Amino acid sequence: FLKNVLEEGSKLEEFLELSPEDKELLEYLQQTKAKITVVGCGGAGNNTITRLKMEGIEGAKTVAINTDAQQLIRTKADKKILIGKKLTRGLGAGGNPKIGEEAAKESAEEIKAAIQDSDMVFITCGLGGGTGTGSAPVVAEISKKIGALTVAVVTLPFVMEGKVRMKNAMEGLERLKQHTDTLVVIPNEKLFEIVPNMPLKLAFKVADEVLINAVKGLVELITKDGLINVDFADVKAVMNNGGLAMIGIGESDSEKRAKEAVSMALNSPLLDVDIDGATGALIHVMGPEDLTLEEAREVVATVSSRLDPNATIIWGATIDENLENTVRVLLVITGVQSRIEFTDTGLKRK
């Protein structure tokens, strides 16, 4: 009986030590925990969720929504939602964000049901298409309505995708910034400065890799046990009014991993903005089984001296089973909307 399940599962929890006070407390933490849901919209959104799912994202429910049934069936997630079951019949919205938006609206109640009791929701997707670009802002609007920390981690299209797609992305990015607490944007075009002679046929595979790493890094920073205390109250603090944000990723293998990883992360072409005054930042330093709090401490210090002396900085350090002799640093600087300008050919640096 599935219905008994939830109730008999507590029997084991409750039933050999603690006192009555600790009895209530322990039984309290059970519920108190922060519920995280990541929602992937459209093509790139769905490829990301599948990996997060298959690789096992820690402490977060995965939701994949799509207007296209073919894509949705190949996707793996804790929950899948075919938005626009009446508007599209599960055939795809094409490159028209207006359809994807309407598709999401149509399934709004279904979406709300998938993120219902979430303390924080991550909306991820690749802008430029019709589904992700159209639905993402609706999922964000619904997220805020249920009262969850609403963060979005999205990518801007490659220039080789065309002005129509970029323009649609920027407009989507605009509508999105309206319903998010913090909006993280990844310019795919810069993916070319990290891998200059990267084969065009691989651009998207790499884009998938970066988004997955970014969403996973941010999410796990909050949920995965590490060498140090990462409190949800702080995340709430930094993410809550983080306007526009960008990321930087780096890693090193040399006997100056931490130091060299920060360098890459800070000089990352993905950080297409002046960060020398940032008011907030989330840092996640991942490494091998030999990772010391000292290295993580060295990364944070490095970054801290670039931001505002008053900058709010959340950081963590987790150990990744299969991580070489390499330490990877995911950097997320917030409140940089005033250093950028929204145009329809991409974001421009002020």
Short mmCIF file of C-alpha atoms in Angstrom, two decimals:
data_model
loop_
_atom_site.label_atom_id
_atom_site.label_comp_id
_atom_site.label_asym_id
_atom_site.label_seq_id
_atom_site.Cartn_x
_atom_site.Cartn_y
_atom_site.Cartn_z
CA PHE A 1 0.00 0.00 0.00
CA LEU A 2 1.65 3.18 -1.27
CA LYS A 3 -0.55 5.23 1.07
CA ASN A 4 0.86 3.53 4.19
CA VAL A 5 4.39 4.09 2.86
CA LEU A 6 4.78 7.72 3.96
CA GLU A 7 3.45 6.85 7.41
CA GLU A 8 5.38 3.64 7.96
CA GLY A 9 8.54 5.39 6.80
CA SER A 10 8.46 7.54 9.95
CA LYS A 11 8.17 4.47 12.19
CA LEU A 12 11.79 3.75 11.34
CA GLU A 13 12.89 7.37 11.76
CA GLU A 14 11.32 7.77 15.21
CA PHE A 15 12.02 4.22 16.42
CA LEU A 16 17.21 4.57 20.48
CA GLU A 17 18.67 7.65 22.17
CA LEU A 18 17.52 11.29 22.09
CA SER A 19 15.30 12.84 24.75
CA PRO A 20 11.79 14.34 24.37
CA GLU A 21 13.09 17.81 23.38
CA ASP A 22 15.50 16.32 20.85
CA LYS A 23 12.54 14.14 19.84
CA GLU A 24 10.52 17.14 18.69
CA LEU A 25 13.56 18.90 17.21
CA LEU A 26 14.82 15.96 15.14
CA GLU A 27 11.27 15.30 13.97
CA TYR A 28 11.15 19.02 13.14
CA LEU A 29 14.27 19.16 10.97
CA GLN A 30 12.63 16.39 8.97
CA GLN A 31 10.07 18.85 7.60
CA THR A 32 12.06 22.09 7.90
CA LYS A 33 14.57 21.09 5.18
CA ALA A 34 14.64 23.31 2.09
CA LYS A 35 12.78 21.90 -0.91
CA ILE A 36 14.47 22.62 -4.22
CA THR A 37 12.98 22.04 -7.63
CA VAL A 38 14.74 22.58 -10.92
CA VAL A 39 12.50 23.04 -13.96
CA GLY A 40 13.98 22.62 -17.45
CA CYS A 41 12.03 24.23 -20.28
CA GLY A 42 12.39 23.32 -23.93
CA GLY A 43 15.19 21.55 -25.79
CA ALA A 44 18.35 22.65 -23.96
CA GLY A 45 16.31 22.82 -20.79
CA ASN A 46 15.36 19.18 -21.13
CA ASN A 47 18.85 17.90 -21.96
CA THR A 48 20.07 19.55 -18.78
CA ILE A 49 17.37 17.98 -16.57
CA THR A 50 18.06 14.50 -17.97
CA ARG A 51 21.72 14.72 -16.93
CA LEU A 52 20.87 16.25 -13.60
CA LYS A 53 18.45 13.35 -13.17
CA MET A 54 20.66 10.52 -14.52
CA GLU A 55 23.77 11.82 -12.71
CA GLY A 56 21.67 12.33 -9.59
CA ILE A 57 21.38 16.02 -8.62
CA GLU A 58 21.50 16.18 -4.82
CA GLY A 59 18.45 17.14 -2.77
CA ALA A 60 16.33 18.58 -5.58
CA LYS A 61 13.29 17.45 -7.58
CA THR A 62 13.69 17.56 -11.35
CA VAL A 63 10.90 18.78 -13.63
CA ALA A 64 11.02 18.88 -17.41
CA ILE A 65 8.36 20.75 -19.34
CA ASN A 66 8.14 20.86 -23.10
CA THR A 67 5.70 21.65 -25.84
CA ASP A 68 7.22 18.84 -27.92
CA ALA A 69 6.24 15.24 -27.06
CA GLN A 70 9.10 13.65 -29.00
CA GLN A 71 11.71 15.59 -26.99
CA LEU A 72 9.86 15.04 -23.74
CA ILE A 73 9.81 11.25 -24.09
CA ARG A 74 13.59 11.07 -24.52
CA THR A 75 14.02 13.28 -21.42
CA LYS A 76 14.44 11.74 -17.94
CA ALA A 77 13.04 13.61 -14.91
CA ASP A 78 11.23 13.15 -11.61
CA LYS A 79 8.26 14.69 -13.38
CA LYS A 80 7.48 15.62 -16.97
CA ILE A 81 4.81 18.02 -18.17
CA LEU A 82 3.63 18.37 -21.75
CA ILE A 83 2.50 22.00 -21.76
CA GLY A 84 -0.07 23.10 -24.32
CA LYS A 85 -1.71 19.66 -24.65
CA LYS A 86 -4.57 21.51 -26.39
CA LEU A 87 -2.63 24.31 -28.07
CA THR A 88 -0.03 22.16 -29.80
CA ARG A 89 -1.14 18.55 -29.29
CA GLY A 90 2.42 17.76 -28.27
CA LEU A 91 3.94 18.66 -31.64
CA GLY A 92 6.22 21.57 -30.80
CA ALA A 93 5.85 25.35 -30.71
CA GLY A 94 8.59 26.04 -33.20
CA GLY A 95 10.52 29.26 -32.81
CA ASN A 96 7.52 31.30 -31.71
CA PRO A 97 7.83 32.29 -28.01
CA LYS A 98 4.18 33.44 -28.09
CA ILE A 99 3.06 29.82 -28.48
CA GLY A 100 5.38 28.52 -25.81
CA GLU A 101 4.04 31.22 -23.48
CA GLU A 102 0.46 30.29 -24.25
CA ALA A 103 1.35 26.61 -23.89
CA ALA A 104 2.70 27.28 -20.40
CA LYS A 105 -0.32 29.40 -19.50
CA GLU A 106 -2.61 26.59 -20.60
CA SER A 107 -0.80 24.14 -18.29
CA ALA A 108 -0.22 26.72 -15.54
CA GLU A 109 -2.21 24.74 -12.98
CA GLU A 110 -0.23 21.62 -13.91
CA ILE A 111 3.04 23.52 -13.49
CA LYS A 112 1.99 24.95 -10.12
CA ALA A 113 1.28 21.39 -9.04
CA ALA A 114 4.82 20.29 -9.92
CA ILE A 115 6.50 23.06 -7.87
CA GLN A 116 3.80 23.44 -5.18
CA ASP A 117 5.78 23.23 -1.93
CA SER A 118 9.16 24.47 -3.13
CA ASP A 119 11.21 26.86 -1.05
CA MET A 120 13.25 27.66 -4.12
CA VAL A 121 12.76 26.95 -7.81
CA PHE A 122 15.39 26.98 -10.54
CA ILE A 123 14.11 27.71 -14.05
CA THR A 124 16.69 26.67 -16.63
CA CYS A 125 16.65 26.77 -20.42
CA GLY A 126 18.36 27.89 -23.62
CA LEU A 127 16.78 31.05 -24.97
CA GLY A 128 16.16 31.59 -28.68
CA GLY A 129 13.54 28.90 -29.17
CA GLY A 130 9.77 29.07 -28.83
CA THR A 131 9.15 26.75 -25.91
CA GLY A 132 11.91 27.70 -23.47
CA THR A 133 11.78 31.38 -24.32
CA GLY A 134 8.01 31.46 -24.01
CA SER A 135 7.38 29.18 -21.04
CA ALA A 136 10.29 30.08 -18.73
CA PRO A 137 8.79 33.47 -17.66
CA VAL A 138 5.44 31.82 -16.88
CA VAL A 139 7.06 29.16 -14.71
CA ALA A 140 8.91 32.00 -12.97
CA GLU A 141 5.74 33.99 -12.48
CA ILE A 142 4.05 30.88 -10.99
CA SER A 143 7.09 30.23 -8.80
CA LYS A 144 6.92 33.67 -7.18
CA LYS A 145 3.20 33.26 -6.72
CA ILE A 146 3.68 30.09 -4.65
CA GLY A 147 6.30 32.11 -2.81
CA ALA A 148 9.50 30.27 -3.73
CA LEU A 149 12.92 31.85 -4.21
CA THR A 150 12.80 32.25 -7.98
CA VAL A 151 16.17 31.88 -9.71
CA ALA A 152 16.77 31.37 -13.42
CA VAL A 153 19.92 29.98 -15.03
CA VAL A 154 19.64 30.52 -18.81
CA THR A 155 21.87 30.72 -21.89
CA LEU A 156 21.88 33.29 -24.69
CA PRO A 157 22.11 31.86 -28.22
CA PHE A 158 25.19 31.62 -30.39
CA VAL A 159 25.34 34.35 -33.01
CA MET A 160 25.31 31.61 -35.64
CA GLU A 161 21.68 31.03 -34.67
CA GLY A 162 20.49 34.30 -36.19
CA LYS A 163 19.13 37.68 -35.23
CA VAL A 164 15.56 36.42 -35.00
CA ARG A 165 16.53 33.90 -32.33
CA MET A 166 18.75 36.34 -30.42
CA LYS A 167 16.05 39.00 -30.55
CA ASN A 168 13.52 36.47 -29.24
CA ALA A 169 15.98 35.52 -26.48
CA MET A 170 16.54 39.11 -25.36
CA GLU A 171 12.80 39.71 -25.25
CA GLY A 172 12.38 36.50 -23.30
CA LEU A 173 15.23 37.57 -21.02
CA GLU A 174 13.39 40.86 -20.47
CA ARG A 175 10.06 39.25 -19.52
CA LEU A 176 12.02 36.81 -17.38
CA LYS A 177 13.83 39.47 -15.39
CA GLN A 178 10.36 40.60 -14.31
CA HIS A 179 9.42 37.43 -12.42
CA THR A 180 12.76 36.34 -11.08
CA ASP A 181 14.54 37.12 -7.84
CA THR A 182 17.86 36.49 -9.53
CA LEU A 183 18.43 35.89 -13.24
CA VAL A 184 21.63 34.15 -14.29
CA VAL A 185 22.59 34.56 -17.97
CA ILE A 186 25.20 32.56 -19.88
CA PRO A 187 26.29 33.95 -23.28
CA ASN A 188 26.86 30.88 -25.44
CA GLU A 189 28.90 32.87 -27.95
CA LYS A 190 31.70 33.21 -25.37
CA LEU A 191 31.88 29.42 -25.29
CA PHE A 192 34.14 30.05 -28.31
CA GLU A 193 36.79 31.91 -26.33
CA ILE A 194 37.23 28.95 -23.99
CA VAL A 195 37.54 26.64 -26.97
CA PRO A 196 38.52 28.87 -30.00
CA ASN A 197 38.74 26.15 -32.63
CA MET A 198 35.64 24.43 -31.27
CA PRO A 199 33.73 22.62 -34.09
CA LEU A 200 30.36 24.24 -34.74
CA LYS A 201 28.71 20.81 -34.69
CA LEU A 202 29.80 20.61 -31.07
CA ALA A 203 28.87 24.13 -29.86
CA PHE A 204 25.56 22.95 -28.38
CA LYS A 205 27.10 19.83 -26.74
CA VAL A 206 29.50 22.18 -24.98
CA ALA A 207 26.63 24.54 -24.18
CA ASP A 208 24.81 21.61 -22.56
CA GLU A 209 27.92 20.84 -20.56
CA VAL A 210 28.25 24.39 -19.23
CA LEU A 211 24.57 24.78 -18.30
CA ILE A 212 24.51 21.40 -16.55
CA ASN A 213 27.62 22.31 -14.62
CA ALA A 214 26.26 25.73 -13.75
CA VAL A 215 22.81 24.58 -12.59
CA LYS A 216 24.31 21.59 -10.76
CA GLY A 217 26.99 23.71 -9.09
CA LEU A 218 24.56 26.33 -7.85
CA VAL A 219 22.05 23.76 -6.67
CA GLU A 220 24.50 21.46 -4.87
CA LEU A 221 26.22 24.44 -3.21
CA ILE A 222 23.04 24.66 -1.22
CA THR A 223 22.13 21.00 -0.80
CA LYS A 224 25.31 18.90 -0.83
CA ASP A 225 27.20 18.27 2.41
CA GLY A 226 30.59 19.92 2.30
CA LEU A 227 33.51 21.08 4.40
CA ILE A 228 31.52 24.08 5.51
CA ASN A 229 28.12 25.34 6.58
CA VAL A 230 25.98 26.80 3.77
CA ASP A 231 22.81 28.28 5.28
CA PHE A 232 19.63 28.74 3.31
CA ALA A 233 19.04 32.05 5.08
CA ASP A 234 22.17 33.36 3.34
CA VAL A 235 21.22 32.03 -0.07
CA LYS A 236 17.83 33.69 0.44
CA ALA A 237 19.77 36.84 1.25
CA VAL A 238 22.04 36.86 -1.81
CA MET A 239 19.58 35.43 -4.37
CA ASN A 240 16.55 37.49 -3.26
CA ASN A 241 17.52 40.78 -4.90
CA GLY A 242 20.28 39.53 -7.17
CA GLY A 243 19.28 41.37 -10.29
CA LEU A 244 21.12 40.08 -13.31
CA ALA A 245 23.99 37.67 -12.64
CA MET A 246 26.69 35.96 -14.69
CA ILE A 247 29.01 33.02 -14.09
CA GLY A 248 32.66 32.15 -14.29
CA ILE A 249 34.02 28.61 -14.16
CA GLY A 250 37.57 27.44 -13.75
CA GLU A 251 39.68 24.51 -12.66
CA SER A 252 43.30 23.61 -12.12
CA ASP A 253 45.42 20.54 -11.64
CA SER A 254 48.75 22.18 -10.81
CA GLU A 255 49.98 22.40 -7.22
CA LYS A 256 48.24 25.73 -7.03
CA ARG A 257 44.83 24.38 -7.93
CA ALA A 258 42.79 26.75 -5.79
CA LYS A 259 44.73 29.83 -6.92
CA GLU A 260 44.76 28.85 -10.58
CA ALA A 261 41.12 27.79 -10.48
CA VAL A 262 40.07 31.23 -9.17
CA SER A 263 42.06 32.93 -11.92
CA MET A 264 40.25 30.99 -14.67
CA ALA A 265 36.90 31.50 -12.94
CA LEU A 266 37.42 35.28 -12.67
CA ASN A 267 38.95 35.70 -16.13
CA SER A 268 36.22 33.47 -17.56
CA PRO A 269 34.83 34.77 -20.87
CA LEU A 270 31.40 33.76 -19.52
CA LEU A 271 31.73 36.63 -17.03
CA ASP A 272 31.07 39.22 -19.71
CA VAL A 273 30.90 42.12 -17.32
CA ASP A 274 32.91 44.37 -15.01
CA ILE A 275 32.71 42.66 -11.60
CA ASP A 276 34.95 45.10 -9.71
CA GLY A 277 32.05 46.39 -7.61
CA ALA A 278 29.62 43.47 -7.40
CA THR A 279 27.39 43.57 -4.33
CA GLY A 280 26.86 39.82 -4.12
CA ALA A 281 28.36 36.47 -5.07
CA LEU A 282 27.94 32.72 -4.64
CA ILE A 283 31.13 30.68 -4.83
CA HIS A 284 31.28 26.91 -5.00
CA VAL A 285 34.68 25.27 -4.87
CA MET A 286 34.56 21.58 -5.71
CA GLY A 287 37.56 19.29 -5.55
CA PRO A 288 39.08 15.84 -4.98
CA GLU A 289 38.97 13.80 -1.79
CA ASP A 290 41.94 15.83 -0.50
CA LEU A 291 40.24 19.24 -0.64
CA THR A 292 41.08 21.44 2.37
CA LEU A 293 39.04 24.32 3.76
CA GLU A 294 42.25 26.38 3.31
CA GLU A 295 42.06 26.22 -0.49
CA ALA A 296 38.37 27.12 -0.48
CA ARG A 297 39.32 29.90 1.93
CA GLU A 298 41.96 31.11 -0.57
CA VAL A 299 39.45 31.15 -3.42
CA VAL A 300 36.95 33.22 -1.46
CA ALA A 301 39.60 35.71 -0.37
CA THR A 302 40.72 36.15 -3.99
CA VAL A 303 37.18 36.87 -5.20
CA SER A 304 36.27 38.95 -2.15
CA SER A 305 38.92 41.56 -2.94
CA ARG A 306 37.40 42.25 -6.37
CA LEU A 307 33.87 42.82 -5.13
CA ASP A 308 32.57 45.61 -2.91
CA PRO A 309 34.08 45.43 0.58
CA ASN A 310 30.44 45.18 1.71
CA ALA A 311 29.59 42.51 -0.86
CA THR A 312 27.46 39.62 0.40
CA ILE A 313 29.28 36.39 -0.34
CA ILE A 314 27.94 32.87 0.14
CA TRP A 315 30.38 30.01 -0.37
CA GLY A 316 30.77 26.28 0.09
CA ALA A 317 33.26 23.51 -0.58
CA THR A 318 32.15 20.04 -1.57
CA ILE A 319 34.13 16.93 -2.42
CA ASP A 320 33.41 15.31 -5.77
CA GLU A 321 34.10 11.57 -5.89
CA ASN A 322 35.33 11.54 -9.48
CA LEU A 323 37.24 14.79 -9.74
CA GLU A 324 40.84 14.01 -10.74
CA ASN A 325 43.50 15.99 -8.84
CA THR A 326 41.49 18.93 -10.15
CA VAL A 327 39.60 21.58 -8.20
CA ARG A 328 36.74 23.29 -10.00
CA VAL A 329 35.40 26.73 -9.08
CA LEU A 330 31.93 27.93 -10.05
CA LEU A 331 31.55 31.66 -9.59
CA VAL A 332 28.24 33.54 -9.69
CA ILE A 333 28.38 37.33 -9.34
CA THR A 334 25.08 39.14 -8.72
CA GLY A 335 23.58 42.60 -9.05
CA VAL A 336 25.40 43.44 -12.28
CA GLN A 337 22.35 44.63 -14.22
CA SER A 338 23.67 48.24 -14.08
CA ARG A 339 26.92 47.22 -15.82
CA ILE A 340 25.01 45.72 -18.75
CA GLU A 341 22.69 46.99 -21.44
CA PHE A 342 19.85 44.96 -22.98
CA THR A 343 19.96 45.18 -26.77
CA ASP A 344 18.54 42.66 -29.25
CA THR A 345 21.84 41.32 -30.55
CA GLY A 346 23.02 40.38 -27.10
CA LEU A 347 23.91 41.97 -23.78
CA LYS A 348 26.34 44.89 -24.05
CA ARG A 349 28.89 46.00 -21.44
CA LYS A 350 28.41 49.52 -20.11
#
